[PDB]
Design a protein around this ligand. Structure first.
Ligand SMILES: N=C(N)NCCS(=O)(=O)O
Ligand SMILES: N=C(N)NCCS(=O)(=O)O
Ligand SMILES: [Cl-]
Length: 541
């Protein structure tokens, strides 16, 4: 009765509603979809299935699973932990923004509708009378919500309204992890069907707006010359990794909770197509609104909103103003955004705690209270997130969004996950394990993706991005300083360096000749030991 689908109905998140439309709009629109679908069926679903299978087979979390499959490349798991840490720093900042918008909805007139407010510049023209001039919806996002600075080197002053909204979300996250609400009960029906109900209303509203056809044509019809830019492939390929929450140890930890004899192949395909289908369908909502905005303002569709983060805060808030009782719909939309983000944030932050606690089960569990450790992790993450709340903190958010938990850092982890399984552990060796679990031998799709398709895409994007290097920009105009780019690369290299560092550490610890050390550290350590004894299973090899 699709019980697993309802339980796993939380596949839709902020990556499908917020990040996907902004990445697609930034990369020209239709040209973004081709790499998106190439990575979807070549390295998006296969890596998701690989992580789920590793979790279900080894019956271990993010790090111990690699400790069992291949000790030498154990650092992969460590890298994932680092990645998730950075994610928890910035992924919650969006929620703060949403919370701010929520507190701005509790009034008779939505503030992003007219140009008679204090923060509005003299260049504010209402879109109705539009046909220099700036839209009131954009100015509220910039002049009021963000209070944007000239650059990242100008941090300005901390925003005391967003700081209190950021703390409010962290208190909710801390309380929902300290007590572990886990959203268990009959609220699962509401928290899984309400986002689709609101996205349907936005979709119907967006489609019926005058000029939506121009926006959809921009969204669908591709620009072939745009594909020659390497950044399109990195943005689209990593977006699959972002929405699928892979290369983080979350799916491997999730996979470990599945029974050994359980057909998780059908679930990964079902959830993968539903998660990516949600992003594609939600794209018709955003871009139909953008087509309407371009139509009335007399501007090009690519120059009517922010290319960076916040497209969902300029397009969706405007669509609300056209619905009857805009106050009612504005509240519901940002309640949906809060529900989608909080559900994802609870899983990742609590997953981060589990990985760190399991690393030191004698100290963080008995000697030092795990309850205090949850407060310590949240407190440190909150302080680091205050760098994205200052007036110049929007530029810091883009650096974290572009480099941390995205870009080459995920391609680095994805490549080594597939390389170890396909070329060291063995695709046929895993297929024998998968055959026992799911009950049948899968097709050659997974085997060829782990061995050829994924490594080629991951290493191909990395090489071509370096050969044709375009520095990160914000909203197509702002040019980051050299230190900001260097700071951004340090965020990516913080986790990328974990894979080779552990290899060096493992070799030093082991004794004997160098060749003996490598061969010893490549041998799996009983990958399915628990399976044969706790349940019914065939021992590996
Ligand atoms: N677990 C899923 N499907 N996604 C996680 C990332 S996001 O969709 O919440 O951004
Ligand atoms: N924010 C969530 N839930 N997932 C992000 C996945 S990743 O981009 O860090 O791989
Ligand atoms: Cl997506």
């Amino acid at each position: 009765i699709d019980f697993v689908l309802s339980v796993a109905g939380g596949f839709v998140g902020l990556g499908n509603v917020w990040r996907f439309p902004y990445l697609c709009y930034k990369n020209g629109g239709g040209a973004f979809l081709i790499p998106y679908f190439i990575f979807l069926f070549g390295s998006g679903l296969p890596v998701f299935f690989l992580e789920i299978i590793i979790g279900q087979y080894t019956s271990e979390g993010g790090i111990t699973c690699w400790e069992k499959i291949c000790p030498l490349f154990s650092g992969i798991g460590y890298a994932s932990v680092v990645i998730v840490s950075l994610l928890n720093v910035y992924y919650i900042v969006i929620l703060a923004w949403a919370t701010y918008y929520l507190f701005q909805s509790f009034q008779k007139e939505l503030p992003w509708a007219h140009c008679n407010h204090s923060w509005n510049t003299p260049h504010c023209m209402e879109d109705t009378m539009r046909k220099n001039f700036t839209s009131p919806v954009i100015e509220f996002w910039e002049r009021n919500v963000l209070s944007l600075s000239p650059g990242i080197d100008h941090p300005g002053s901390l925003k005391w309204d967003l700081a209190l909204c950021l703390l409010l979300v962290w208190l909710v996250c801390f309380f929902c992890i300290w007590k572990g609400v886990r959203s268990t009960g009959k609220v699962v029906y509401f928290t899984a069907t309400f986002p689709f109900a609101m996205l349907l209303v936005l979709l119907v509203r967006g489609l019926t707006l005058p000029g939506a056809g121009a926006g959809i044509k921009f969204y669908l019809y591709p620009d072939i010359t745009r594909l020659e830019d390497p950044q399109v492939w990195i943005d689209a390929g990593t977006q699959i990794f972002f929405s699928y929450a892979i290369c983080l140890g979350a799916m491997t930890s999730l996979g470990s909770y599945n029974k050994y004899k359980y057909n998780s192949y059908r679930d990964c395909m079902l959830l993968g197509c539903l998660n990516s289908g949600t992003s594609f369908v939600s794209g018709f909502a955003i871009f139909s609104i953008l087509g309407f905005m371009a139509q009335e303002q007399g501007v090009d569709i690519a120059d009517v909103a922010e290319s960076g983060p916040g497209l969902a805060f300029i397009a969706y808030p405007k669509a609300v103003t056209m619905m009857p009782l805009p106050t009612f719909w504005s509240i519901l939309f940002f309640i949906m955004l809060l529900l989608l983000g909080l559900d994802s944030q609870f899983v990742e932050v609590e997953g981060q705690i589990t990985s760190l606690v399991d690393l030191y089960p004698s100290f963080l569990r008995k000697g030092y209270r795990r309850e205090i450790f949850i407060a310590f992790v949240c407190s440190i993450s909150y302080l680091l997130g205050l760098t994205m709340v200052t007036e110049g903190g929007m530029y810091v958010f883009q650096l974290f969004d572009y480099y941390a938990a995205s870009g080459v850092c995920l391609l680095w982890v994805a490549f080594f996950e597939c390389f170890v399984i396909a070329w060291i552990y063995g695709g046929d060796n895993l297929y024998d394990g998968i055959e026992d679990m799911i009950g049948y031998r899968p097709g050659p799709w997974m085997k060829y993706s782990w061995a050829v398709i994924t490594p080629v895409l991951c290493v191909g994007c990395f090489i071509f991005s370096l050969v044709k290097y375009v520095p990160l920009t914000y909203n197509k105009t702002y040019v980051y300083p050299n230190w900001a780019i260097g700071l951004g690369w340090s965020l990516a290299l913080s986790s990328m360096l974990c894979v080779p560092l552990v290899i060096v550490i493992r070799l030093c610890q082991t004794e004997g000749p160098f060749l003996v050390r490598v061969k010893y550290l490549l041998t799996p350590r009983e990958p399915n030991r628990w399976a044969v004894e706790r349940e019914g299973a065939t021992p590996y090899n």
